[PDB]
Scaffold this active site. Sequence first.
Site, PDB file in Angstrom:
ATOM      1  N   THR A   1       6.604  -0.110   6.393  1.00 31.25           N
ATOM      2  CA  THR A   1       5.425  -0.526   5.038  1.00 31.25           C
ATOM      3  C   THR A   1       4.568  -1.023   5.526  1.00 31.25           C
ATOM      4  OG1 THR A   1       7.738  -1.321   2.915  1.00 31.25           O
ATOM      5  CG2 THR A   1       5.411  -2.192   3.205  1.00 31.25           C
TER       6      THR A   1
ATOM      7  N   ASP B   1       1.109  13.596  13.912  1.00 31.25           N
ATOM      8  CA  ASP B   1       2.476  13.877  13.021  1.00 31.25           C
ATOM      9  C   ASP B   1       0.741  14.432  11.747  1.00 31.25           C
ATOM     10  OD1 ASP B   1       5.042  13.673  11.677  1.00 31.25           O
ATOM     11  OD2 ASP B   1       4.198  11.819  10.809  1.00 31.25           O
TER      12      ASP B   1
ATOM     13  N   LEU C   1       0.355  -1.553   0.097  1.00 27.63           N
ATOM     14  CA  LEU C   1      -0.135  -0.084  -0.509  1.00 27.63           C
ATOM     15  C   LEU C   1       1.041   1.167   0.191  1.00 27.63           C
ATOM     16  CD1 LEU C   1      -2.785  -1.165   2.326  1.00 27.63           C
ATOM     17  CD2 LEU C   1      -3.011  -0.822  -0.529  1.00 27.63           C
ATOM     18  N   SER C   2       1.402   1.566   0.482  1.00 26.19           N
ATOM     19  CA  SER C   2       2.985   2.505   1.272  1.00 26.19           C
ATOM     20  C   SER C   2       4.542   1.825   1.626  1.00 26.19           C
ATOM     21  CB  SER C   2       2.578   3.088   1.570  1.00 26.19           C
ATOM     22  OG  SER C   2       1.931   3.165   3.418  1.00 26.19           O
ATOM     23  N   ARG C   3       4.491   3.121   1.640  1.00 27.60           N
ATOM     24  CA  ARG C   3       6.127   2.941   2.040  1.00 27.60           C
ATOM     25  C   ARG C   3       6.920   3.734   2.320  1.00 27.60           C
ATOM     26  NH1 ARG C   3      11.495  -1.095  -0.150  1.00 27.60           N
ATOM     27  NH2 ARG C   3       9.557  -2.427   0.993  1.00 27.60           N
ATOM     28  N   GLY C   4       6.469   4.095   3.163  1.00 23.32           N
ATOM     29  CA  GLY C   4       7.617   5.316   4.337  1.00 23.32           C
ATOM     30  C   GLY C   4       8.982   4.798   5.151  1.00 23.32           C
ATOM     31  N   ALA C   5       9.316   6.504   5.796  1.00 21.77           N
ATOM     32  CA  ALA C   5      10.498   5.869   6.602  1.00 21.77           C
ATOM     33  C   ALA C   5      10.144   5.163   7.590  1.00 21.77           C
ATOM     34  CB  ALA C   5      11.350   7.074   6.833  1.00 21.77           C
ATOM     35  N   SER C   6       8.664   5.769   8.196  1.00 25.97           N
ATOM     36  CA  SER C   6       8.152   4.783   9.246  1.00 25.97           C
ATOM     37  C   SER C   6       7.840   3.116   9.657  1.00 25.97           C
ATOM     38  CB  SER C   6       7.170   5.641  10.621  1.00 25.97           C
ATOM     39  OG  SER C   6       5.825   5.218   8.885  1.00 25.97           O
TER      40      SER C   6
ATOM     41  N   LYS D   1       1.279  -2.410   9.164  1.00 26.21           N
ATOM     42  CA  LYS D   1       2.787  -1.184   9.608  1.00 26.21           C
ATOM     43  C   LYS D   1       3.544  -2.527   9.646  1.00 26.21           C
ATOM     44  CE  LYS D   1       3.636   3.386   9.445  1.00 26.21           C
ATOM     45  NZ  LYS D   1       3.780   4.856   9.001  1.00 26.21           N
TER      46      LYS D   1
HETATM   47  C1  LIG Z   1      -4.716   3.760  -3.525  1.00 23.31           C
HETATM   48  C2  LIG Z   1      -4.464   2.159  -3.736  1.00 23.31           C
HETATM   49  N1  LIG Z   1      -6.243   2.254  -2.915  1.00 23.31           N
HETATM   50  C3  LIG Z   1      -5.902   0.284  -3.271  1.00 23.31           C
HETATM   51  C4  LIG Z   1      -4.899  -0.289  -2.717  1.00 23.31           C
HETATM   52  C5  LIG Z   1      -6.203   2.143  -1.652  1.00 23.31           C
HETATM   53  C6  LIG Z   1      -6.052   2.234  -0.429  1.00 23.31           C
HETATM   54  O1  LIG Z   1      -5.411   2.339   0.603  1.00 23.31           O
HETATM   55  C7  LIG Z   1      -4.662   2.251   1.561  1.00 23.31           C
HETATM   56  C8  LIG Z   1      -5.389   1.730   2.449  1.00 23.31           C
HETATM   57  C9  LIG Z   1      -4.726   1.883   3.971  1.00 23.31           C
HETATM   58  N2  LIG Z   1      -5.825   1.333   4.971  1.00 23.31           N
HETATM   59  C10 LIG Z   1      -5.629   1.204   6.111  1.00 23.31           C
HETATM   60  N3  LIG Z   1      -4.213   1.965   6.660  1.00 23.31           N
HETATM   61  C11 LIG Z   1      -3.684   2.513   6.131  1.00 23.31           C
HETATM   62  N4  LIG Z   1      -2.728   3.254   6.055  1.00 23.31           N
HETATM   63  C12 LIG Z   1      -1.837   3.192   7.860  1.00 23.31           C
HETATM   64  C13 LIG Z   1      -1.920   1.856   8.594  1.00 23.31           C
HETATM   65  C14 LIG Z   1      -0.800   1.767   9.612  1.00 23.31           C
HETATM   66  O2  LIG Z   1      -1.148   0.209  10.334  1.00 23.31           O
HETATM   67  C15 LIG Z   1      -1.558  -1.067   9.687  1.00 23.31           C
HETATM   68  C16 LIG Z   1      -1.181   2.848  10.224  1.00 23.31           C
HETATM   69 CL1  LIG Z   1      -0.218   3.107  11.664  1.00 23.31          CL
HETATM   70  C17 LIG Z   1      -1.271   4.255   9.496  1.00 23.31           C
HETATM   71  C18 LIG Z   1      -1.079   3.911   8.026  1.00 23.31           C
HETATM   72 CL2  LIG Z   1      -1.228   5.433   8.048  1.00 23.31          CL
HETATM   73  C19 LIG Z   1      -3.764   2.487   4.130  1.00 23.31           C
HETATM   74  C20 LIG Z   1      -3.319   3.175   3.465  1.00 23.31           C
HETATM   75  C21 LIG Z   1      -3.604   2.890   2.252  1.00 23.31           C
HETATM   76  O3  LIG Z   1      -2.752   3.922   1.288  1.00 23.31           O
HETATM   77  C22 LIG Z   1      -2.933   3.217   0.048  1.00 23.31           C
END
Ligand SMILES: CCN(CC)CCOc1cc2ncnc(Nc3cc(OC)c(Cl)cc3Cl)c2cc1OC
Lengths: 278, 271
Positions: B23, B132, B16-21, B39
């Site tokens: 994946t 943050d 879903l995402s790759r940050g410094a803190s 995460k």
């Molecule tokens: C465009 C992509 N589409 C479909 C693939 C939308 C789906 O995208 C996400 C869904 C997420 N669902 C839950 N959590 C997220 N992030 C997160 C999780 C944490 O712990 C588990 C913490 Cl501690 C913090 C965060 Cl921000 C998410 C981040 C996403 O980014 C794209």
Amino acid sequence: ALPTIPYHKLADLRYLSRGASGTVSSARHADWRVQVAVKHLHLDSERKDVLREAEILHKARFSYILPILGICNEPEFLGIVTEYMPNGSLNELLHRKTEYPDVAWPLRFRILHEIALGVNYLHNMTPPLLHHDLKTQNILLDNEFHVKIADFGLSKWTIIYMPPENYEPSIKHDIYSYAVITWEVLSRKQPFEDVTNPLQIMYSVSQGHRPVINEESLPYDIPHRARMISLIESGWAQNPDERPSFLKCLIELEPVLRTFEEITFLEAVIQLKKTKLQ
Amino acid sequence: ALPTIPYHKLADLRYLSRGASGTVSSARHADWRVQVAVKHLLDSERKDVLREAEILHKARFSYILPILGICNEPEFLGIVTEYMPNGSLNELLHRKTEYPDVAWPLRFRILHEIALGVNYLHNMTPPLLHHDLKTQNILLDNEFHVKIADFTIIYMPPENYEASIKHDIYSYAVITWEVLSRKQPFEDVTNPLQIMYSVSQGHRPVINEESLPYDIPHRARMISLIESGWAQNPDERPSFLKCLIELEPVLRTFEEITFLEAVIQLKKTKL
Ligand SMILES: CCN(CC)CCOc1cc2ncnc(Nc3cc(OC)c(Cl)cc3Cl)c2cc1OC
Ligand SMILES: CCN(CC)CCOc1cc2ncnc(Nc3cc(OC)c(Cl)cc3Cl)c2cc1OC
């Protein structure tokens, strides 16, 4: 661990329900500026017992379980505080037919799916909940008509959702309740509507009688009608051992829900809300 | 007692995402049969990461991302939350082929819910020590309701690189600007040092006919709120209570059905 909420933070109390276990009212939290609900649970021995009971419920955290926000620990007054569910109970949706003349199938099946996911979660907790009282009155509907179940112990601490083996006081209680609820969702009828004495319901049920399944109670256009009827009849089987697990329900239901596109759910909700505006 | 979740219960991890803190991946919980997010973040550090996460467990509110448990593995620490199908506010604002329109009612609802969520965190006892807030950790559920996961430097107030209680409102002012403009703050500036220096000297994202069009509902009130929120002097910045007071009138001007029409139109156009 569960946050304490001073009663003085709550204002504009309005009646929601009056059950044996306690009164429920909506209220407005002074600091959070949102609506909440509070259940007024009708000695130090009782206070200790009521905190322990509520901290057990604190373990349950899941999207289809009513979130408990805290406890009111007042001198004369014990209260559980939860999120407020703007669209009320499943019972209201099914039976208020002026308000809700139509409830599209996709929404009904989404409700059934979410109920089962919620109960499945409760059944996978370690330990599980010791008390079970699932009914249409404690299945609540949020602003987007998603389910949050509030079938905590509290009810134990109506008999139409209760299995016959529980009349003389198993991990097969909830599925029986769910089968009746499923029937009620698909029919929008009162289970055992003809019978007016609850004791007569109990006798009939103990002898294997169940809500009626025919072309009138369950319409022809129910999606996967024959599989759903089969699921209902298995769920309320006289023999608890013949009843499926919630895992098995979810396996049966997931295919049915795949037949609806995500946008049809939103269209079903919006059509509910539009019609309701008259 | 935040529930422990064995890592083996999570399957079909997808990026879903790759940050410094860490994946973040989506996953399927074997027993619950739903999507979750995880995460991927010594005994002294493990204990400190558990303590930090159990503090976040106290926060229970509709606009805060629920933490469902911790993956407490020997070599692997992981936070598990609800999965937010529509991702981050950042994706919605900046992916303009995917989302050519984001109707105003929806934007204001997002702003309202963010402020309710942060207001909640600020009223906790004790309040959160770490702050943050950014568009990347403001998440959107299936019906585009907000869940914040605020448990880049454009959201950081000047006093951070030269107050504790006036950080989030600064971030919120920038976020508000970003929501109403759908522009990248400081887009022209390519050296992060130049952003930091500029900000420390009182410069802010630009407010004019180009960044914030004249057709923005309640443009004047919103601009007033933005400029107060990112004030150089932390003392001049409003509380979130004051934001909510200013916002509630604005949100009353939209009927509840317009929000749902905005969401449905978003999903239709996205096809
Ligand atoms: C465009 C992509 N589409 C479909 C693939 C939308 C789906 O995208 C996400 C869904 C997420 N669902 C839950 N959590 C997220 N992030 C997160 C999780 C944490 O712990 C588990 C913490 Cl501690 C913090 C965060 Cl921000 C998410 C981040 C996403 O980014 C794209
Ligand atoms: C009059 C408004 N009506 C119109 C149709 C809509 C809103 O109605 C309800 C909202 C509710 N929100 C949350 N909780 C409820 N009940 C409850 C609370 C509990 O603890 C506090 C426990 Cl432990 C259990 C339950 Cl069931 C609710 C019950 C409601 O109407 C019966």
